[PDB]
Amino acid sequence: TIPHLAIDPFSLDFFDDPYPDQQTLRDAGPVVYLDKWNVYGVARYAEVHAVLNDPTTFCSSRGVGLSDFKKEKPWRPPSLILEADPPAHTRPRAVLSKVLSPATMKTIRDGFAAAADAKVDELLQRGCIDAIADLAEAYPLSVFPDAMGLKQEGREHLLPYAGLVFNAFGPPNELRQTAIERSAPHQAYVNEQCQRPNLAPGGFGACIHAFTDTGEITPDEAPLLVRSLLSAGLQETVNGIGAAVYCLARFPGELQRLRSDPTLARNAFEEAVRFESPVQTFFRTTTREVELGGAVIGEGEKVLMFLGSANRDPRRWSDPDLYDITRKTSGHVGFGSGVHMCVGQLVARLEGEVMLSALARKVAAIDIDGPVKRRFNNTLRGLESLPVKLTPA
Ligand code: HEM
Ligand SMILES: COc1ccc(C(=O)O)cc1
Ligand SMILES: [Cl-]
């Protein structure tokens, strides 16, 4: 009663243009079986939203990649928040929520915003730039690692470790094995910067270590929670900002609208997050037999959620393939939904908003003027290179 498909959502051809295959996955049925990896798939907004919001039946403590932690060893000690279920998840989540609080955004906002303006001002002096390396990448590297409290040496390890983390959610294909065999130096730098003496006072990491006397987490838990923010805190944002820029370059009517009202910047980024879904997919594991969209899924089965496909589901979105900076984006799953919904979304939206605001005030046109290149990853969607000519306003 469940349609079996041979689509590999982790193949290179799929990454190259996922969107037809995602329609085929949505239209086959509410639940599909993916024979290549032996997992269930859900690609419609409805079923994705349901799975995300039933963490008792679709837990994350057996991993949220293909590997089931009850069967295989994880490639690194489990995250205390991503790879945990309530109740063990609850208090480490409260710590990271407070570390990344509204009050904390108040303190870095003007710094983040200035750095966005300085970066756009700097790129307008060059004209022809690469909006991935010189912007999408350069901007978050200039404000996140300082906000984390990190030393300066070794920062070249952060994006590679992020790409490793997201590649290791995927199946044991060559992208994953090659990331793991390249991993050791990045693992080593990251784990070391998680120790309390290496985290500059006032930053996010020091704050995490300072939350250890409340009975919410203990001191030996602090290093791993810092690790979370060195894993999840960079590449997505970069991909999300690279997508905004791309969209603004590819849809010049939306750039003309952003310029006319820069207050649209925040929702313009939110729309980029929905349109690109930098995190394309996550897994859950069933803790019990369950009925999902008229199928009966046994205990201990991996379920693949297509988040980017739920964000383009014509059953939920009008013209889902169009980038509309005035769209009501509320409800998209680009950040998840429910108990694990991105705990750092306030940092991402603040980075992306102030970047787009900067562009909206200072740029008249953005024109692709060279070969666009994609970056392949088992979990992340984003560009490798996006040569643009920026035109000062
Ligand atoms: C556009 C940028 C981002 C996107 C698209 C994104 C995507 C996601 C998604 C889909 C989830 C839910 C995972 C799940 O349900 O298993 C998540 C959770 C998480 N994110 Fe983000 N994220 C972004 C930025 C950030 C930032 C800036 C941080 C840190 C500052 C961060 C740290 C985390 C952590 C620690 C979790 C785990 C939360 C939990 O398990 O309860 N992410 N992210
Ligand atoms: C959604 O992406 C991630 C990746 C890693 C972690 C973590 O290491 O906790 C959390 C979220
Ligand atoms: Cl690691």
Measured in degrees and rounded to the nearest 5, phi and psi for residue 79 equal: -60, 145
Q: Is residue 342 lining ligand 1, measured as CB closer than 6 Å? A: yes
Q: Pick from 49, 144, 136, 151: which is nearest to 344 by CA?
A: 144
- Whether the ω angle into residue 18 lies within 30 degrees of 0, i.e. cis, is no
Show the domain range for 322.
4-392
Nearest-angstrom CA–CA distance, 359 and 246: 13
PDB resolution in Å: 2.0
How many whole angstroms from 69 Cα to the centroid of ligand 3? 16
Q: What is the CATH number of the domain that holds 188?
A: 1.10.630.10
Compute CA distances 53 → 218, 231, 315, whole Å. Answer: 28, 23, 19
Strand partners, 286: 58
Q: Is 96 left (phi over 0), alpha (psi -120 to 50) or beta?
A: alpha
Q: Tokens at residue 102, please?
A: 């509204």
- DSSP line for 49-84: HHHHT-TTTEESTT-SSSS-TTTS--SSPPPSSTT-
Nearest-angstrom CA–CA distance, 350 and 108: 9
Q: Is residue 242 lining ligand 1, measured as CB closer than 6 Å? A: no
The set of residues, in sequence order, having a beta carbon less than 8 Å from that of 48 and lying 6+ positions away, is: 42, 305, 306, 307, 309, 310, 333
Compute CA distances 73 → 70, 87, 253, 295, whole Å. Answer: 8, 23, 50, 30
Nearest-angstrom CA–CA distance, 365 and 252: 8
Nearest-angstrom CA–CA distance, 62 and 251: 41
From the CA of 236, give the closest atom in ligand 2.
2
Tell me if residue 143 falls in helix, strand or coil. helix
Q: Pick from 142, 138, 128, 113: which is nearest to 392 by CA?
A: 128
Method used to obtain the model: X-ray
The set of residues, in sequence order, having a beta carbon less than 8 Å from that of 392 and lying 6+ positions away, is: 124, 362, 363, 364
Query: For the chain, what is the domain count?
Result: 1
Are 334 and 278 a contacting pair, CB within 8 Å?
Answer: yes
Q: Is residue 258 lining ligand 1, measured as CB closer than 6 Å? A: no
- 93 half-sphere exposure, CB direction, 13 A CA radius: 16
Task: Give the position of tokens 């010189």.
Answer: 134
Amino acid identity at 243? A
Q: Pick from 213, 195, 215, 214: which is nearest to 205 by CA?
A: 195
Are 271 and 324 a contacting pair, CB within 8 Å?
Answer: yes
Are 67 and 336 a contacting pair, CB within 8 Å?
Answer: no
